[PDB]
Design a protein around this ligand. Structure first.
Ligand SMILES: CCC1=C(C)/C(=C/C2=NC(=C\c3[nH]c(/C=C4\NC(=O)[C@H](C)[C@H]4CC)c(C)c3CCC(=O)O)/C(CCC(=O)O)=C2C)NC1=O
Ligand SMILES: CCC1=C(C)/C(=C/C2=NC(=C\c3[nH]c(/C=C4\NC(=O)[C@H](C)[C@H]4CC)c(C)c3CCC(=O)O)/C(CCC(=O)O)=C2C)NC1=O
Ligand SMILES: CCC1=C(C)/C(=C/C2=NC(=C\c3[nH]c(/C=C4\NC(=O)[C@H](C)[C@H]4CC)c(C)c3CCC(=O)O)/C(CCC(=O)O)=C2C)NC1=O
Ligand SMILES: CCC1=C(C)/C(=C/C2=NC(=C\c3[nH]c(/C=C4\NC(=O)[C@H](C)[C@H]4CC)c(C)c3CCC(=O)O)/C(CCC(=O)O)=C2C)NC1=O
Ligand SMILES: CCC1=C(C)/C(=C/C2=NC(=C\c3[nH]c(/C=C4\NC(=O)[C@H](C)[C@H]4CC)c(C)c3CCC(=O)O)/C(CCC(=O)O)=C2C)NC1=O
Lengths: 161, 160, 158, 162, 160, 158, 160, 160
């Protein structure tokens, strides 16, 4: 893929917007184009942005923030109460950036996307069986999230789990 | 199909169809009547091709129907011939669509695991598909045989 | 997504049968109209900006209260989101017109759009009026060939 | 013998006229089907022994009394003559298909054949059944258009006998 | 070119060329001689298209060459017609390549930022490219007119 | 990556000049040889498994030591990686054969490959012998049409 | 050859070549390059064709090379492969001559008596020649393969 | 190995060995004599097990050594026996290690695509390994047979 395709895909995957709507990360984009940072480092630059906190934390409850982080950086949804609660605790005690770092350093991320692919959803049972403690629930939540990908659901996070 | 791939490529860049993608679509729409002719020929001779391919496969590789063979018996041989017919219908779909997506979605995705579980000898399946390719190329002209062989070879490569 | 040919293929596959005379007739009919549909798509693509401009003009002439303070299209951001939505509708209607099947609109446009509009307070009847204005513009420009696809978007919101 | 081209030629010679548009349509129609006929003839010639094996097997399965004692096809000589006659029918049908005209079947096959078989005691209904078996077997080899063409001459033989 | 797009698609999926991409390549190679004819006629007459389009653009909006305008002055008009010549050459490149890529790498990626910094009116450039499309179709046959018009319209659309 | 038409376009663009008669002639020469190159590529694609099998057989018959314990091809995994690399070379040779230009090989295959084989311990001369074997296999089927690209891969390795 | 057959025909009626016979000779001389190409491909590839045909024939009919088989032993297997090579070279002659006369003269007249008395299974020879025919068709284009298949099937039908 | 697995599990959480991990390592160290005994019996009877398993496989699936089989020919049957001996050595490795890592990283990872490309019938390999399992069970006592059967079964499951 070209750097342009990677950039547009990253902006849609992480910030749910096209690049023209946003103030682009010019230096991060230049570093990716020059090839001294990976796609993963650009994804983390998008997560670290103040625009990410404005979009997905300023006007949201921490459970919604956890769901947003799982959709953006893993391509799925939190399946159990333990996983969602652990991520909420990470956000509420260490900050948004440390939670995003935990998502990026996870073995799940390394296996599915590694260092050069933009994250994406995968509605397959192999996606969740080994990785998730509630695989069927993980599939149900991921499929519902993909079904209405345009929407930012306001259904309570712990009602889904 | 051929149109779907162009439309998805345009959607990747969030733009309308480019002159190249429109050239692709126009070429496919031009090939449509030739595709319909070939697909109809392979459809009317479905029993033709299936019996010819099955006889060629069983003569080439008789251990399939020999005792202890996977297709031993009238029922298992009938299911083997039905699989050959399945792949023939999928070749017709691939000819009509202009790409291989119907073949993958209906027949190729998961067939390797399925046959591995069933201990279905994939080389024998390749023999059957190649025999069906020869049978169909017999019933077509040179050109029509060329495009039919395109999807027959795609099926052969995907199985192997 | 599907186009017309893949839709016919799926129909014949659900029944487990080879293509018959009627199936080949339908596929041939689709191939025959392909040149006209490509001309319509190219015509729309050439004037997408002007179609969008006069479609937004029609929408906001019919309902000026959307632009006024307190309206759902009052800010630079919300006006921009509105015309971006209309641009989406035009582009994906063109995609569907090329494909001859509306599944692209289901996959890429109506995947949570009605829920999104109910959640954000976007007025759905006003959006359908705008979609209808764009349908009329495109119809006056190329003919009736695309009407159904726009109606599909309307039915996805209504 | 008479093929389709010489059939047109004979009509126009007898009426003494040069070819007109209608004659040229008949001749174009013959030439257009020529490649299919040549292909079918090559396929039948390559497969003639197999066609005869399959057709004789189907016939003697459907009428086992022919090859058991007391049957007309019971001896090595009479079995050999039976499948020889089947070779006739296949070869002359192939000739008539290549020529596109049934005149050779009248001149070279059907003339006096009922009398030969009735004098010999050869059962003609079973011979028609064998011709039908060859028709299906040949159609199984040559494909739709060639099968439809060859079936015309097989049916002409069947009607001339039956 | 049209070949590069197909090869990129095959490379992305890590597979050999599919029947559809082979069909695309065959179509492009079949269209090559018409492409060369159209590109040659466009190249030989570049001066007259540039002159006519520049004239028409200037009359359609005098404010461009009026004092205070972006193209006011001799040097700025020379750069104006140089840009028109550039875009015409890229249109010929796109006709030859069978896709719009050379147009993208050489001329249109970054043209929006450049013209916004230079305060170049995009509607003025679009009027110039439109005028160029009329001048080009003026000396083309209908098929060649449409072939070039696809790329002219692509340039216009990407300009806005 | 480039192809013949794109490299010609780049050459004319560096000089900022419209296409000349020589440029058009070179383009027409590329267009003329298109069908033969496509047929060769299709033959290679249809026979990829057999070409791999017989080229690996030739390589490991000429140099059995690679398959013995201690050889760089001694495991199921290292043998699989070897035949996988041969598949890389064949597929990209087909790509360059269709394109008519070797830049896809330089970018997708030869970019950093020599240093990677040094880092892993892969014997480069044996890999070159494998590429030459596959050259012979492909020449026995399609003729000398694809010899240039395999030679380019071999020299890049060497 | 075709020329010889036309000359023999004209000589039987003691006349010069008629328009039909001139057409036959002219169409044969026209086909010379195609016949030479086909014969070159079959000749230069005789070794691999015979190896492949023999492998296919022995897999299809193992009892031939099993103890008590007609081809059992190194010498008898070598003569079997030599017979397959003989028939391939006769097919090349038939392609070059444009008729089956050299095949009849050198290989076919007496081959039934020869094989009956040597107890050579004619169906096995037919299987080997069919295998050689497919191996040749692998090496030839559709038209060239169709040209060679005429003489291959002629040999097969003379066997049967 | 078992110790390697425990140490990696400790390292992933950046901690010293857990009491459960210590129990795992201790139990592994206790089983050392039994593992050495099983492995020594297997290695001393390597040729006997290989011959018996190969013979059993070859009557069970005679299509393999039959003409046209994947193992027909002295070189190919020898390579078949060599792979059986390979998997026997790997089974000894697994018995000594207390884990299946040597089996995976020497012979199991990549054998699936390798055998797919070589057209090696995996069911035949599985029958050969089961025959080797029976041979080992004959040479070992019940407990030793069960311990070796763990890794024989692991290889069987990995192959399928
Ligand atoms: C670990 C626990 C677990 C389970 C059990 C599970 C089930 C499961 N089955 C699925 C699909 C499926 N499952 C089935 C199985 C059904 N077909 C019918 O004929 C049978 C009665 C029945 C099986 C006996 C089928 C056919 C699909 C495909 C559905 C589709 O693609 O439309 C999917 C969607 C993802 C995929 O296709 O891989 C899941 C998540 N997931 C899990 O994480
Ligand atoms: C490519 C597929 C796609 C579609 C279809 C799409 C529609 C879409 N429109 C949205 C908001 C919106 N949509 C509108 C448009 C409405 N304003 C009303 O006055 C009009 C009647 C009407 C339009 C005719 C507005 C104003 C918003 C902003 C809502 C807000 O910020 O409160 C949103 C919420 C997120 C955002 O604003 O970026 C989506 C997802 N987005 C997509 O990615
Ligand atoms: C009175 C003179 C006479 C004879 C002898 C004769 C033989 C004869 N054998 C037949 C079948 C057969 N005959 C045999 C005999 C062969 N099996 C082995 O190969 C052996 C070498 C050999 C016998 C020792 C076999 C196997 C068939 C069945 C062949 C088939 O249907 O494919 C048939 C076909 C119809 C039927 O099955 O009844 C005939 C007519 N017919 C006659 O009118
Ligand atoms: C150039 C024209 C020509 C032809 C056609 C020809 C055929 C031929 N093959 C022969 C022997 C043979 N031919 C074969 C071949 C058979 N082995 C298997 O059964 C197969 C079914 C089959 C071949 C596919 C074998 C095994 C022999 C040796 C038999 C014996 O020694 O008794 C012989 C007897 C003399 C000899 O040993 O060479 C002739 C004349 N010779 C000629 O000079
Ligand atoms: C130490 C780890 C290791 C393993 C596991 C291994 C398996 C292995 N077996 C191979 C060939 C082979 N493998 C077999 C064995 C199979 N075919 C028979 O039919 C049986 C069903 C079955 C055995 C029970 C045969 C016959 C070949 C020869 C194929 C050929 O060379 O054409 C090859 C290809 C390289 C070569 O021919 O030497 C590998 C890599 N190699 C390794 O270095």
């Amino acid at each position: 893929a070209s750097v342009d395709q990677i950039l547009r895909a990253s902006y849609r995957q992480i910030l749910e917007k096209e690049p023209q709507e946003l103030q682009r990360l010019s230096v991060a984009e230049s570093q990716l184009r020059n090839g001294e940072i990976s796609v993963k480092e650009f994804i983390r630059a998008l997560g670290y942005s103040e625009i990410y906190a404005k979009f997905f934390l300023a006007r949201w409850y921490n459970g919604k923030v956890a769901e947003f982080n799982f959709k953006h950086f893993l391509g799925r949804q939190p399946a159990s109460a333990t996983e969602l609660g652990s991520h909420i605790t990470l956000i509420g005690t260490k900050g948004l950036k440390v939670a995003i770092d935990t998502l990026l350093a996870s073995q799940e991320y390394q296996d599915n996307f590694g260092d050069d692919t933009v994250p994406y959803y995968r509605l397959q049972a192999e996606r969740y069986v080994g990785t998730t403690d509630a695989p069927s629930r993980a599939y149900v939540l991921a499929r519902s999230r993909v079904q209405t990908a345009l929407n930012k659901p306001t259904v309570p996070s712990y009602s889904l789990v | 199909s051929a149109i779907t791939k162009a439309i998805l490529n345009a959607d990747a860049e969030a733009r309308y169809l480019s002159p190249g993608e429109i050239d692709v679509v126009r070429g496919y729409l031009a090939s449509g009547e030739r595709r319909v002719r070939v697909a109809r020929v392979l459809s009317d001779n479905a029993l033709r091709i299936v019996r010819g391919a099955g006889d060629t496969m069983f003569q080439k590789r008789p251990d399939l129907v020999a005792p202890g063979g996977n297709a031993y018996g009238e029922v298992r041989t009938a299911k083997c011939l039905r699989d050959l017919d399945y792949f023939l219908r999928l070749v017709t779909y691939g000819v009509l669509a202009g790409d291989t997506s119907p073949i993958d979605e209906i027949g190729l995705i998961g067939i390797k695991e399925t046959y591995s579980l069933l201990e279905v000898p994939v080389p024998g399946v390749i023999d059957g598909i190649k025999a069906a390719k020869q049978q169909a190329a017999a019933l077509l002209s040179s050109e029509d045989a060329a495009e039919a062989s395109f999807y027959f070879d795609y099926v052969i490569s995907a199985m192997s | 997504m599907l186009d017309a040919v893949t839709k016919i293929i799926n129909r014949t596959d659900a029944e487990g049968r080879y293509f018959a005379s009627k199936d080949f007739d339908e596929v041939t009919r689709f191939f025959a109209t392909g040149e006209a549909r490509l001309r319509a798509a190219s015509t729309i693509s050439a004037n997408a900006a002007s179609i969008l401009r006069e479609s937004a003009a029609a929408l906001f002439t019919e309902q000026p209260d959307l632009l006024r303070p307190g309206g759902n299209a009052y800010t630079s951001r919300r006006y921009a989101a509105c015309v971006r939505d209309m641009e989406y509708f035009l582009r994906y209607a063109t995609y569907a017109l090329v494909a001859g099947d509306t599944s692209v609109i289901d996959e890429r446009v109506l995947n949570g759009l009605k829920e999104t509009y109910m959640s954000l307070g976007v007025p759905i009847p006003s959006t359908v009026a705008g979609v209808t204005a764009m349908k009329g513009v495109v119809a006056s420009m190329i003919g009736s060939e695309a009407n159904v696809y726009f109606d599909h978007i309307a039915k996805g919101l209504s | 013998m008479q093929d389709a081209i010489t059939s047109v030629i004979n009509t126009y010679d007898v009426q003494g006229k040069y070819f007109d548009t209608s004659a040229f349509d008949k001749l174009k129609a013959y030439y257009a089907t020529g490649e299919l006929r040549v292909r079918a003839a090559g396929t039948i010639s390559a497969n003639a022994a197999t066609i005869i094996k399959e057709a004789s097997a189907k016939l003697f399965s459907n009428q086992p009394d022919l090859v058991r004692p007391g049957g007309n096809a019971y001896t090595t000589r009479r079995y050999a003559a039976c499948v020889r006659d089947m070779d006739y029918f296949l070869r002359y049908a192939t000739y008539a298909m290549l020529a596109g005209d049934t005149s050779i079947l009248d001149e070279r096959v059907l003339n006096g054949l009922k009398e030969t078989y009735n004098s010999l005691g050869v059962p003609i209904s079973s011979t028609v059944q064998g011709i039908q078996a060859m028709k299906e077997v040949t159609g199984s080899l040559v494909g739709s258009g060639a099968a439809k063409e060859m079936g015309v001459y097989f049916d002409y033989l069947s009607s001339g006998l039956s």
